[PDB]
Coordinates of C-alpha atoms in Angstrom, one line a residue:
Chain A
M1 CA 2.4 22.5 -8.1
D2 CA 0.2 23.0 -5.0
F3 CA 0.9 20.8 -1.9
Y4 CA -1.9 20.5 0.6
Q5 CA -0.2 19.4 3.8
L6 CA 0.1 19.5 7.6
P7 CA 3.7 19.9 8.8
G8 CA 3.6 17.3 11.6
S9 CA 2.0 14.6 9.4
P10 CA 4.6 11.8 8.5
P11 CA 3.1 11.2 5.0
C12 CA 3.2 15.0 4.3
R13 CA 6.8 15.1 5.4
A14 CA 7.5 12.0 3.2
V15 CA 6.2 13.9 0.2
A16 CA 8.1 17.1 1.2
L17 CA 11.3 15.2 1.5
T18 CA 10.7 13.6 -1.9
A19 CA 10.2 17.0 -3.6
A20 CA 13.4 18.2 -1.9
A21 CA 15.4 15.1 -3.0
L22 CA 14.1 15.8 -6.6
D23 CA 14.7 19.6 -6.4
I24 CA 11.0 20.2 -7.0
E25 CA 9.5 23.5 -5.8
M26 CA 6.0 23.2 -4.5
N27 CA 3.5 25.8 -3.3
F28 CA 2.8 24.7 0.2
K29 CA -0.8 25.1 1.5
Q30 CA -1.7 24.6 5.1
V31 CA -5.0 22.7 5.7
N32 CA -5.4 23.7 9.4
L33 CA -8.7 25.6 9.4
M34 CA -10.3 23.7 6.5
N35 CA -12.8 22.1 8.9
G36 CA -13.5 25.3 10.8
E37 CA -16.9 26.8 10.8
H38 CA -17.9 29.6 8.3
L39 CA -15.4 28.8 5.5
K40 CA -17.0 30.0 2.2
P41 CA -18.3 27.3 -0.2
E42 CA -15.9 28.8 -2.8
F43 CA -13.1 28.1 -0.3
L44 CA -14.4 24.5 0.5
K45 CA -14.5 23.6 -3.2
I46 CA -10.7 24.1 -3.4
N47 CA -10.0 22.0 -0.3
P48 CA -8.8 18.5 -1.0
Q49 CA -11.9 16.2 -0.8
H50 CA -9.8 13.1 0.1
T51 CA -6.8 12.7 2.4
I52 CA -3.8 14.8 3.2
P53 CA -1.3 15.1 1.6
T54 CA -2.7 16.0 -1.8
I55 CA -0.9 17.6 -4.7
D56 CA -2.5 19.6 -7.5
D57 CA 0.0 19.5 -10.4
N58 CA -1.5 21.8 -13.1
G59 CA -4.9 20.5 -12.4
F60 CA -3.9 16.9 -11.8
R61 CA -5.1 16.0 -8.3
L62 CA -3.3 13.2 -6.5
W63 CA -3.8 12.0 -3.0
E64 CA -2.1 9.0 -1.3
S65 CA 1.4 9.9 -0.2
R66 CA 3.2 6.9 -1.6
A67 CA 1.5 7.3 -5.0
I68 CA 2.5 11.0 -5.0
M69 CA 6.1 10.0 -4.2
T70 CA 6.4 7.6 -7.1
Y71 CA 4.6 10.1 -9.4
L72 CA 7.0 12.9 -8.5
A73 CA 10.1 10.6 -8.9
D74 CA 9.2 9.5 -12.4
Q75 CA 7.7 12.8 -13.6
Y76 CA 10.4 15.1 -12.2
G77 CA 13.4 13.0 -11.3
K78 CA 16.6 13.7 -13.2
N79 CA 18.2 10.3 -12.4
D80 CA 17.3 6.7 -11.7
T81 CA 18.4 6.0 -8.1
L82 CA 15.5 7.3 -6.0
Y83 CA 13.0 5.1 -7.9
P84 CA 15.0 2.9 -10.3
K85 CA 13.6 2.1 -13.7
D86 CA 14.9 -1.4 -13.4
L87 CA 11.9 -3.5 -12.7
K88 CA 13.3 -5.8 -10.0
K89 CA 14.8 -2.9 -8.1
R90 CA 11.5 -0.9 -8.5
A91 CA 9.5 -3.9 -7.3
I92 CA 11.5 -4.0 -4.1
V93 CA 10.9 -0.2 -3.5
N94 CA 7.2 -0.8 -4.1
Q95 CA 7.2 -3.7 -1.8
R96 CA 8.9 -1.7 1.0
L97 CA 6.4 1.2 0.4
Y98 CA 3.5 -1.2 1.0
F99 CA 5.3 -2.4 4.2
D100 CA 5.8 1.1 5.3
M101 CA 2.1 1.9 5.0
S102 CA 0.6 -1.4 6.3
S103 CA 3.1 -2.1 9.1
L104 CA 5.2 0.8 10.1
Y105 CA 2.9 3.8 9.7
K106 CA -0.1 1.7 10.7
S107 CA 1.6 0.8 14.0
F108 CA 2.6 4.4 14.6
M109 CA -0.9 5.6 14.1
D110 CA -2.6 2.8 16.0
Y111 CA -0.6 3.7 19.1
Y112 CA 0.0 7.5 19.0
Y113 CA -3.2 8.8 17.4
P114 CA -5.5 8.0 20.3
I115 CA -2.9 9.3 22.8
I116 CA -1.9 12.4 21.0
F117 CA -5.3 13.5 19.7
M118 CA -7.9 12.0 22.0
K119 CA -5.6 12.0 25.1
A120 CA -6.5 8.3 25.4
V121 CA -4.9 5.8 27.7
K122 CA -1.9 3.9 26.2
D123 CA -2.7 0.6 24.5
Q124 CA 0.1 -1.9 25.4
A125 CA -0.9 -4.3 22.7
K126 CA -0.7 -1.5 20.1
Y127 CA 2.6 -0.3 21.6
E128 CA 4.2 -3.8 20.9
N129 CA 3.0 -3.6 17.3
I130 CA 5.5 -0.8 16.7
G131 CA 8.3 -3.1 17.9
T132 CA 7.0 -5.8 15.6
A133 CA 7.1 -3.5 12.6
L134 CA 10.5 -2.2 13.6
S135 CA 11.8 -5.7 14.0
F136 CA 10.8 -6.4 10.3
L137 CA 12.5 -3.1 9.2
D138 CA 15.6 -4.1 11.2
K139 CA 15.7 -7.4 9.3
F140 CA 15.4 -5.7 5.9
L141 CA 18.3 -3.5 6.9
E142 CA 20.6 -6.4 8.0
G143 CA 23.8 -6.0 5.9
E144 CA 22.3 -3.1 4.0
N145 CA 23.0 0.6 3.7
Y146 CA 19.4 1.4 2.7
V147 CA 15.9 0.0 3.2
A148 CA 15.1 -1.1 -0.3
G149 CA 18.2 -1.3 -2.5
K150 CA 21.9 -0.3 -2.8
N151 CA 21.0 3.5 -2.9
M152 CA 18.7 5.8 -1.1
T153 CA 15.2 5.4 -2.5
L154 CA 11.7 6.6 -2.0
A155 CA 11.3 3.9 0.6
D156 CA 14.0 5.4 2.8
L157 CA 12.2 8.8 2.6
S158 CA 8.8 7.4 3.5
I159 CA 10.1 5.2 6.3
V160 CA 12.2 8.0 7.8
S161 CA 9.2 10.2 8.1
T162 CA 7.8 7.7 10.6
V163 CA 11.0 6.5 12.2
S164 CA 12.1 10.1 12.9
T165 CA 8.7 10.7 14.5
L166 CA 9.2 7.7 16.8
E167 CA 12.5 9.1 18.0
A168 CA 10.9 12.6 18.4
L169 CA 8.3 10.9 20.7
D170 CA 11.2 9.3 22.8
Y171 CA 10.7 5.8 21.3
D172 CA 14.1 4.1 21.9
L173 CA 15.5 2.6 18.6
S174 CA 18.8 1.3 20.0
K175 CA 17.8 -2.4 20.1
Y176 CA 17.0 -2.1 16.4
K177 CA 20.7 -1.8 15.7
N178 CA 20.2 -1.7 11.9
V179 CA 17.4 0.8 12.1
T180 CA 19.6 3.0 14.3
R181 CA 22.6 2.7 12.0
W182 CA 20.4 3.5 9.0
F183 CA 18.7 6.4 10.6
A184 CA 22.0 8.0 11.6
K185 CA 23.5 7.6 8.1
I186 CA 20.4 8.6 6.1
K187 CA 19.7 12.0 7.7
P188 CA 22.9 13.7 6.4
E189 CA 22.1 12.3 2.9
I190 CA 18.5 13.5 2.7
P191 CA 18.4 16.9 1.0
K192 CA 16.8 19.6 3.2
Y193 CA 16.1 17.0 5.9
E194 CA 16.1 19.7 8.6
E195 CA 13.8 22.0 6.7
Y196 CA 11.2 19.5 5.5
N197 CA 11.1 16.8 8.2
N198 CA 12.9 17.7 11.4
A199 CA 11.2 21.1 11.8
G200 CA 7.8 19.5 11.5
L201 CA 8.6 17.1 14.4
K202 CA 8.4 20.0 16.9
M203 CA 4.8 19.3 17.9
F204 CA 5.9 15.8 18.9
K205 CA 9.0 16.7 20.8
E206 CA 6.7 19.0 22.8
Chain B
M1 CA 8.3 -18.6 -12.7
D2 CA 7.2 -20.3 -9.5
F3 CA 4.0 -19.0 -7.8
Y4 CA 3.6 -19.9 -4.1
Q5 CA -0.1 -19.5 -3.3
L6 CA -3.2 -20.6 -1.6
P7 CA -6.3 -20.8 -3.9
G8 CA -8.7 -19.2 -1.5
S9 CA -6.5 -16.2 -0.7
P10 CA -7.7 -13.0 -2.4
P11 CA -4.1 -11.6 -2.9
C12 CA -3.1 -14.9 -4.5
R13 CA -6.1 -14.8 -6.8
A14 CA -5.2 -11.2 -7.7
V15 CA -1.8 -12.3 -8.8
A16 CA -3.2 -15.3 -10.6
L17 CA -5.7 -13.1 -12.5
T18 CA -2.8 -10.7 -13.4
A19 CA -0.8 -13.6 -14.8
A20 CA -3.8 -14.7 -16.8
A21 CA -4.5 -11.2 -18.1
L22 CA -0.9 -11.0 -19.3
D23 CA -0.8 -14.6 -20.7
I24 CA 2.0 -15.5 -18.3
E25 CA 2.4 -19.2 -17.4
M26 CA 3.4 -19.8 -13.8
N27 CA 4.3 -23.0 -11.9
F28 CA 1.8 -23.0 -9.1
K29 CA 3.0 -24.3 -5.7
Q30 CA 0.6 -25.0 -2.9
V31 CA 1.8 -23.8 0.5
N32 CA -0.7 -25.9 2.5
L33 CA 1.5 -28.2 4.6
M34 CA 4.5 -25.8 4.9
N35 CA 3.8 -25.3 8.6
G36 CA 3.2 -29.0 9.3
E37 CA 5.5 -31.0 11.6
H38 CA 8.4 -33.0 10.2
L39 CA 9.0 -31.2 7.0
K40 CA 12.8 -31.5 6.1
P41 CA 15.0 -28.4 6.6
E42 CA 15.9 -28.8 2.9
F43 CA 12.1 -28.4 2.1
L44 CA 11.8 -25.5 4.6
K45 CA 14.6 -23.5 3.0
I46 CA 12.6 -23.4 -0.3
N47 CA 9.4 -22.2 1.5
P48 CA 8.8 -18.5 1.1
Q49 CA 10.1 -16.9 4.3
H50 CA 7.7 -13.9 4.1
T51 CA 4.0 -13.7 3.1
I52 CA 1.9 -15.5 0.5
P53 CA 1.7 -14.9 -2.5
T54 CA 5.4 -15.1 -3.4
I55 CA 6.8 -15.5 -6.8
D56 CA 10.3 -16.8 -7.7
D57 CA 11.1 -15.5 -11.2
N58 CA 14.4 -17.1 -12.2
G59 CA 15.8 -16.6 -8.7
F60 CA 14.2 -13.2 -8.1
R61 CA 12.0 -13.6 -5.0
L62 CA 9.1 -11.2 -4.7
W63 CA 6.4 -11.0 -2.0
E64 CA 3.6 -8.4 -1.6
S65 CA 0.8 -9.2 -4.1
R66 CA 0.4 -5.6 -5.4
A67 CA 4.2 -5.3 -5.9
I68 CA 4.1 -8.6 -7.8
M69 CA 1.2 -7.4 -9.9
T70 CA 2.9 -4.2 -11.1
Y71 CA 6.2 -6.1 -11.6
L72 CA 4.5 -8.7 -13.8
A73 CA 2.6 -6.0 -15.8
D74 CA 5.7 -4.1 -16.7
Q75 CA 8.1 -7.1 -17.1
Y76 CA 5.7 -9.2 -19.2
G77 CA 2.8 -7.1 -20.4
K78 CA 2.6 -6.8 -24.2
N79 CA 0.5 -3.6 -24.1
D80 CA -0.1 -0.5 -21.9
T81 CA -3.6 -0.6 -20.7
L82 CA -3.4 -2.9 -17.6
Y83 CA -0.7 -0.7 -16.1
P84 CA -0.3 2.4 -18.3
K85 CA 3.1 3.9 -18.7
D86 CA 1.5 7.3 -18.6
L87 CA 2.5 8.7 -15.3
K88 CA -0.8 10.3 -14.3
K89 CA -2.8 7.2 -15.2
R90 CA -0.2 5.0 -13.5
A91 CA -0.4 7.2 -10.4
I92 CA -4.2 6.6 -10.2
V93 CA -3.7 2.8 -10.5
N94 CA -1.1 3.0 -7.7
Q95 CA -3.4 5.1 -5.6
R96 CA -6.3 2.6 -6.0
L97 CA -3.9 -0.3 -5.2
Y98 CA -3.1 1.4 -1.8
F99 CA -6.8 1.9 -1.2
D100 CA -7.5 -1.7 -2.1
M101 CA -4.9 -2.9 0.5
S102 CA -5.5 -0.4 3.3
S103 CA -9.3 -0.1 3.1
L104 CA -11.0 -2.9 1.1
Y105 CA -8.8 -5.9 1.9
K106 CA -8.2 -4.7 5.4
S107 CA -11.9 -4.5 6.1
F108 CA -12.5 -7.9 4.6
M109 CA -9.8 -9.5 6.7
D110 CA -10.7 -7.7 9.9
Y111 CA -14.2 -9.1 9.7
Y112 CA -14.0 -12.5 8.1
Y113 CA -10.6 -13.8 9.4
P114 CA -11.6 -14.2 13.1
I115 CA -14.9 -15.7 12.0
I116 CA -13.6 -18.1 9.3
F117 CA -10.4 -19.2 11.0
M118 CA -11.0 -18.8 14.8
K119 CA -14.7 -19.4 14.6
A120 CA -15.0 -16.1 16.5
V121 CA -18.2 -14.1 17.2
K122 CA -19.0 -11.5 14.6
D123 CA -17.7 -8.0 15.2
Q124 CA -20.5 -5.5 14.2
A125 CA -18.0 -2.6 14.2
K126 CA -15.7 -4.4 11.8
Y127 CA -18.7 -5.5 9.7
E128 CA -19.6 -1.8 9.1
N129 CA -16.0 -1.1 8.0
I130 CA -16.6 -3.3 4.9
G131 CA -19.5 -1.0 4.0
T132 CA -17.4 2.0 4.6
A133 CA -14.7 0.7 2.2
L134 CA -17.4 -0.3 -0.3
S135 CA -18.9 3.2 -0.2
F136 CA -15.5 4.7 -1.1
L137 CA -15.2 2.2 -4.0
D138 CA -18.7 3.0 -5.1
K139 CA -17.8 6.7 -5.3
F140 CA -14.7 5.9 -7.3
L141 CA -16.9 4.1 -9.8
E142 CA -19.5 6.8 -10.2
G143 CA -19.7 7.5 -13.9
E144 CA -16.8 5.1 -14.6
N145 CA -16.5 1.8 -16.3
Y146 CA -13.4 0.7 -14.3
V147 CA -12.0 1.5 -10.8
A148 CA -8.9 3.4 -11.8
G149 CA -9.0 4.6 -15.4
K150 CA -10.8 4.3 -18.8
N151 CA -9.7 0.6 -19.2
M152 CA -9.4 -2.4 -17.0
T153 CA -6.2 -2.1 -14.9
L154 CA -4.4 -4.0 -12.2
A155 CA -6.6 -2.2 -9.7
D156 CA -9.7 -3.9 -11.1
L157 CA -8.0 -7.3 -10.7
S158 CA -6.9 -6.7 -7.2
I159 CA -10.2 -5.2 -6.1
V160 CA -12.3 -8.0 -7.7
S161 CA -10.3 -10.6 -5.8
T162 CA -11.9 -9.2 -2.6
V163 CA -15.3 -8.1 -4.0
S164 CA -15.9 -11.5 -5.5
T165 CA -15.1 -13.1 -2.1
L166 CA -17.6 -10.8 -0.4
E167 CA -20.3 -11.9 -2.8
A168 CA -19.2 -15.6 -2.3
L169 CA -19.7 -15.0 1.5
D170 CA -23.3 -13.7 0.8
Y171 CA -22.4 -10.0 1.4
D172 CA -25.1 -8.1 -0.5
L173 CA -23.5 -5.6 -2.9
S174 CA -26.8 -4.2 -4.4
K175 CA -26.9 -0.9 -2.5
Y176 CA -23.4 -0.2 -4.0
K177 CA -25.0 0.2 -7.4
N178 CA -21.7 1.2 -9.1
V179 CA -19.8 -1.7 -7.5
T180 CA -22.6 -4.1 -8.7
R181 CA -22.5 -2.7 -12.2
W182 CA -18.7 -2.8 -12.3
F183 CA -18.6 -6.4 -10.9
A184 CA -21.1 -7.6 -13.4
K185 CA -19.2 -6.1 -16.4
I186 CA -15.7 -6.9 -15.3
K187 CA -16.1 -10.7 -14.8
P188 CA -16.6 -11.5 -18.6
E189 CA -13.7 -9.2 -19.4
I190 CA -11.1 -10.8 -17.0
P191 CA -9.3 -13.6 -18.9
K192 CA -9.7 -17.0 -17.2
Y193 CA -11.7 -15.4 -14.4
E194 CA -13.5 -18.7 -13.7
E195 CA -10.3 -20.8 -13.5
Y196 CA -8.1 -18.4 -11.5
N197 CA -10.6 -16.6 -9.2
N198 CA -14.1 -18.1 -9.1
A199 CA -12.9 -21.7 -8.6
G200 CA -10.9 -20.6 -5.5
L201 CA -14.0 -19.1 -3.9
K202 CA -15.4 -22.5 -3.3
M203 CA -14.2 -22.7 0.4
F204 CA -16.1 -19.5 1.1
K205 CA -19.4 -20.5 -0.7
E206 CA -19.3 -23.6 1.6

């Protein structure tokens, strides 16, 4: 399996953490210079034509991180708990994955992408949208050990890829007491969290 | 099964079309006056506390239209084709569902919600985002009968709930030749399309 990725990208780290939690080896490919000038057409035809992350699983090309995550869980997961077969439990994981995309990651990108990439001036309205998303996450976690069920699921892995980036960027999570409790308890439970998520945060800590 | 819905809402119609395609009866509930003054607390406690659509399936509460759709397909679908069990085919349906949410429906709402609801002035930048999303959809449909596989799937039903709304609002689809071909061929194949989608477009045609 080839894994086209950027180490700092939260969705890439979400997929990397999923592969680690499933004990899946992937051949990591770095898509840094894929937009640089003078790359051969033969090299361009191998590049993912859509978004990063993309996997190539024996010819099966798949983009969209959360679709990759549920594909890996079912195709390669030994047990149930990361993406339960039970339809009600699975539905809640799916629900939380849509929330992760449309609220949490969206708010992260809306605020930090203009700043980090374009060196733009902070948008206070977009900044508050992070807190709005985090307030929803905090409510999901009230009285819960995990974000979408009684065990760690794919939704924990996808959400942690963004929440850990927020903390790496000095966003204070303390007032989201359930988010803080969950984030502290989840990191030691995530296989190879340091290798496949924390290490890729370095660009943000800088 | 109770179905908390608004007839004009594309995500509500996507769920309604899914239930029809699966031959699922639902008890439709209209959430019109749920924000009106002087509704009893006993009535408010039954109201969905999150977003519309919401189903209540024998006590199991589920919001997020695309999570509802995949839940209904697996829990109540007699056959495979609407949401194939095959993991690669299922992954592509899931991928297209995320696209539907994050590009197609997002672009529809960004442009039409301020206009329709707040009577706001048109945003030309947001208008062009619809064409951008439709251009991606048109590419997915190149050489294809359906948006996410060799048969009609949940992704066709979710996407048609927004594409049909665009046409009802006099958005011209002709230049998206694959979207136009797909839209024309899909409507006669969708069970009870008239009852559960076309009828709810009336507010937009007006």
